[PDB]
Point group: C4
Chain length 227, copies 4
């Protein structure tokens, strides 16, 4: 087509720097809205601000959808950028409260826009694929010990191991090692005195696996450097 | 001998993929049996399912024992695969309850069958042999401090250090650092005010050794790469 | 100018070794002043000692400012060395109590003077610049989860998430993993039973990011060695 | 001189393997003596055993001192081997109870005798010298924050920060992160609401330094391999 003009504006630096400025202003706005006193004083300016920024972001997404239609929905950053826009597009009384809490995720658009942020985030995602083998191992391991722990402690201890889900949680807690013994294992042993046969091996296996996953991360990082 | 036929079926992909499907179905079954309501509704279909799958697995192990007899009992994956089959072969009322909880280990047959899982598990086992020197060091160290801590705190504090085993446990807990001070050392110091001479050095030695073991894992991994 | 004499004294070893000896004597002095009994016995000798050492340090800084004026205020070690001198130069009744507690920082002048200490400290500072990308990521992440957690739990749980700052703190605590579950998440779930959807993902993201930052430190260290 | 005979016996394998067997027998003995029931049954055989083994070890040390006099007291393994022998040589009623608890250290003679154990222990000691710079840094840092924390919280909180030593301990506890917040910082903030300015930076500095020390261990290990 002005199509060259609108694609030289959308891909212009000033357009994306401007929506960056709008993102930062909105983040401060969202920070201030937690103050109940600030919300008694300037509750109207901020909400009108939120409305004007949501409309700007929606037209900005419409333009970005136009200038490169096929890529926009095959590109992860813009896909997410479209989804957080959409989630906050549904009016706050049109959705459940949880939708209004998710609206906060619209600040990650700062990670979307800032290219140093893009670089680092896709670096962490890049780490993820090697870990799949040991994540699959470990979630099978957690499933098995959830099952055994439910069937072993979930009547005398229905608070912690009564369910499969409760056992998943208490096992994750034991894995992070928080309160693993004065909190879970010792009270257990007040009734089942060989409960440490279940948990001490569990601790050993889970910690060994975690260490090895970390070392794995490290060598995958280093191989691209020694080459 | 059909011996070529049965060894072209046992070593066929479909046979092992089928027992993989059976393993997954059984894992979901075992997951559902923890629900007491599901067990009131469909307690019979699942138990008949468990019986038909245990017979399939037992004939599958019999065939696998036949086609390569000598290797089957000199191969770790199949050895374990035989043992978990056997453990759940003993009827649930023929054994103690703990046997029924061990039956859950039959889901690790998924690690046995899936070759990506085999690769990663034998990778972790491969890590293990280098660690033997420092494991032997450390268990001697734990034995010595168990002994000293029992003889030092196990009358005024029989809950935690009254025995050698109780001291082993409380020392392992202090090693994982859980509640090491507000939980153990400080209550101790209410009666023995120099108890930190025992535990602070213990903490230092045990943490230093743990770090060094991890670094050791790392360099053993890296040497095979710089070569 | 004696200017050559005073610059051959300031840059002399004995001058800086002497202020090192004075720094150590002052550190022991500061250690002793916490004893209330020692302060009843020799409260006067130590305070006169503090006054004579502060005057020596102030003239030492005046000389060092003279011999190389332009560099002194463009050099970090001496800049800090000037600032800790100044902070304790304000009389103890001229400032708030917090100023008297900051006076203790005058012992880091030992890190300033000792060159092995300088080497190691600037080594740690040298590590810092690479971490900026992931620190910026993470503080955005903490800001977002502070906001969501305040809006989600800060009425039923005003102690922990009532404010943005309180939520920052409780989230940092959950990040260090201290008491994350028996302390925060479980009491929460007594009222909001899906609170683990908020915290378990938070734990996962924050731990993964921390691991990756550490690995990043490591590879940055190693690249200067494989080269 | 038989001097060749006694030096071909002392340096014989059988002599050192025999004292290894004696060390293991004594370790089991020491383990059994914690049982009060075993001590009612066989309290005499074990004590006579302890006496016969202590005499064997003392003559063994006398022989080892003879065959190479100058080296024995310039060699760390044998020096320690001499000292643990001496500590348990003082009769149990001739010393304080703590001496009888130290007698347990005579089991580390197993690390002294076993050469794989020697290899690994001197490997860990070998790691230690590089860490000196950051240990010296850190103990200065701990001294400074002990001082500030005593002067800041040791009247309203004399249990934890009343002394310099108590503050050292509570700071070490905060460093290991155990109960750092629900245990120390939060109760503090009930009276001093900006106590997190002191501890959150302390946590950050101490953790960063710890990470860097570990990375330092790692690169020192790796440089001897890339060479
Ligand atoms: C990216 C991270 C940057 C750094 C983040 C800084 C966060 C600062 C948090 C500290 C603020 C909270 C402390 C505080 O005491 O504030 C009180 C208010 C809420 O209480 P308030 O409503 O004042 O009290 C009500 C009294 N009542 C019930 C009797 C009527 O709470 C407030 O006043 C909230 C103050 C708003 C802080 C907004 C800071 C935004 C930082 C910029 C981040 C933009 C990144 C895109
Ligand atoms: C590939 C990308 C990375 C992703 C990898 C992470 C994989 C996580 C697997 C989680 C699968 C389990 C999820 C699940 O089954 O949810 C169960 C519970 C929910 O409890 P629930 O019963 O809903 O609570 C309601 C309370 N009620 C009924 C009494 C009213 O919720 C929990 O208990 C969840 C607790 C955490 C589970 C962690 C499981 C092991 C993950 C291993 C991660 C690898 C580390 C090396
Ligand atoms: C490998 C890991 C994959 C992901 C694992 C997913 C785990 C999901 C766990 C969450 C389920 C538990 C949550 C929940 O509230 O369920 C309740 C039931 C038990 O309570 P229920 O019997 O319903 O209540 C009794 C009521 N009474 C006493 C008054 C009669 O508890 C249940 O309903 C159990 C539901 C069965 C979940 C089975 C999921 C299997 C995942 C596939 C793994 C196959 C790998 C080979
Ligand atoms: C080579 C492959 C890797 C394997 C390496 C792991 C080595 C583990 C060594 C364990 C040896 C000690 C086992 C033991 O003596 O059991 C004692 C206690 C059992 O307590 P118990 O007295 O049975 O409780 C009954 C209560 N009662 C009598 C009052 C009714 O049970 C416990 O207290 C066990 C607590 C954990 C002990 C950890 C010992 C140090 C292991 C160092 C691991 C290396 C880390 C760097
Ligand atoms: C760099 C680190 C080196 C190693 C640091 C060593 C730190 C030693 C801390 C242990 C001392 C505290 C233990 C203790 O019980 O001392 C008590 C006094 C305070 O209580 P005190 O005033 O004696 O009791 C009052 C009784 N009343 C209320 C009834 C009248 O508290 C004291 O007596 C304080 C004793 C002063 C220790 C000064 C040590 C300085 C180490 C050298 C560091 C110089 C580096 C530049
Ligand atoms: C580049 C050099 C390295 C530096 C990187 C560190 C960045 C730290 C960012 C901190 C920004 C947040 C500061 C802030 O907003 O302060 C809020 C609270 C203060 O609570 P406040 O409301 O003042 O308490 C008064 C109580 N009242 C009102 C009821 C009377 O104070 C807190 O809650 C602070 C708690 C710690 C916050 C940690 C935030 C995430 C940092 C991520 C660090 C990277 C790790 C991978
Ligand atoms: C290097 C590490 C190897 C593995 C270490 C194995 C450690 C085993 C610890 C578990 C034993 C303790 C469990 C237990 O219930 O034993 C009870 C006794 C003490 O209570 P007891 O005196 O039986 O009860 C008194 C009853 N009363 C007051 C009413 C008269 O406590 C005992 O019976 C103690 C049993 C002695 C265990 C000796 C094991 C030595 C392992 C070999 C290490 C040699 C390395 C050089
Ligand atoms: C080169 C080879 C490696 C060695 C490096 C380790 C360096 C350790 C430095 C320790 C210096 C401080 C020792 C000290 O001053 O002792 C003070 C307290 C003793 O408390 P105390 O006042 O005796 O308790 C009596 C109670 N009373 C008076 C009320 C009846 O006892 C404590 O509080 C000690 C707590 C641990 C202190 C840790 C200090 C920082 C060490 C940094 C280690 C490096 C890690 C990166
Ligand atoms: C990233 C990795 C390949 C890249 C590579 O270099 N391989 C070596 C790493 C090992 C990919 C490619 C093939 C992937 C697995 C298979 O789809 C199925 C398998 C089923 C299990 O039930 C649990 C998931 C498993 C482990 C999968 C995830 C894993 O992430 C693998 C190994
Ligand atoms: C894996 C390792 C060798 C492989 C290698 O490359 N060596 C260098 C690693 C050191 C193997 C081979 C020889 C093994 C030791 C001896 O049998 C006895 C010894 C007795 C102690 O009481 C405790 C166990 C000790 C440490 C054993 C375990 C250890 O695991 C060693 C070193
Ligand atoms: C040390 C690093 C460059 C050195 C290097 O080798 N680069 C590769 C490392 C990535 C420096 C140079 C440019 C720096 C960033 C930009 O100023 C802005 C950016 C804005 C975000 O909102 C948060 C801060 C970000 C990430 C900054 C900090 C970061 O520390 C960068 C990457
Ligand atoms: C192992 C290390 C040298 C080996 C090396 O390769 N150097 C580079 C490592 C840095 C040795 C040799 C010189 C040692 C220091 C000085 O005696 C004094 C100094 C005084 C401080 O108040 C605290 C102790 C300091 C840091 C000492 C310990 C440290 O351990 C050093 C650096
Ligand atoms: C079959 C598996 C073989 C068994 C061997 C595997 C090793 C398992 C060790 C036991 C696990 C307990 O794990 C426990 O975790 C805590 C976490 O605070 C460690 O505390 C840690 O401090 C520092 C700082 O992070 C770490 O760098 C270090 O790795 C570790 O010492 C304890 O030192 C460790 O003992
Ligand atoms: C001026 C200094 C610059 C500031 C930057 C330095 C980083 C400091 C991070 C904040 C310190 C809190 O440290 C907190 O320790 C706990 C210990 O369980 C970590 O938990 C850890 O789990 C795994 C398993 O060990 C580690 O490999 C990982 O490094 C870390 O995530 C928390 O994730 C981390 O947040
Ligand atoms: Ca932890
Ligand atoms: Ca821990
Ligand atoms: Ca902990
Ligand atoms: Ca921790
Ligand atoms: Ca810890």
């Amino acid at each position: 087509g002005m199509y060259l003009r609108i694609t030289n504006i959308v891909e212009s630096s000033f357009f994306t720097k401007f929506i960056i400025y709008l993102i930062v202003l909105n983040g401060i706005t969202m920070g201030l809205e937690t103050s109940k006193t600030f919300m008694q004083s300037f509750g109207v300016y901020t909400t009108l601000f939120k409305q004007i920024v949501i409309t700007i972001f929606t037209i900005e997404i419409i333009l970005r959808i136009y200038v490169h239609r096929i890529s926009f929905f095959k590109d992860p950053w813009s896909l997410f950028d479209f989804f957080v826009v959409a989630i906050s597009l549904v009016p706050t009384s049109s959705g459940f409260e949880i939708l209004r809490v998710l609206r906060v995720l619209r600040l990650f658009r700062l990670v979307t826009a800032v290219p140093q942020m893009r670089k680092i985030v896709s670096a962490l995602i890049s780490v993820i694929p090697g870990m799949l083998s040991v994540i699959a191992l470990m979630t099978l391991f957690f499933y098995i010990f959830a099952i055994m722990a439910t069937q072993l402690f979930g009547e005398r201890f229905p608070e912690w191991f009564g369910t499969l889900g409760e056992s998943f949680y208490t096992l994750f807690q034991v894995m992070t090692q928080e309160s693993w013994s004065m909190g879970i294992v010792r009270p257990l042993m007040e009734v089942y005195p060989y409960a440490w046969v279940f948990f001490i091996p569990f601790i050993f296996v889970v910690t060994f696996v975690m260490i090895n996953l970390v070392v794995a991360i490290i060598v995958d990082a280093m191989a691209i450097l020694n080459q």
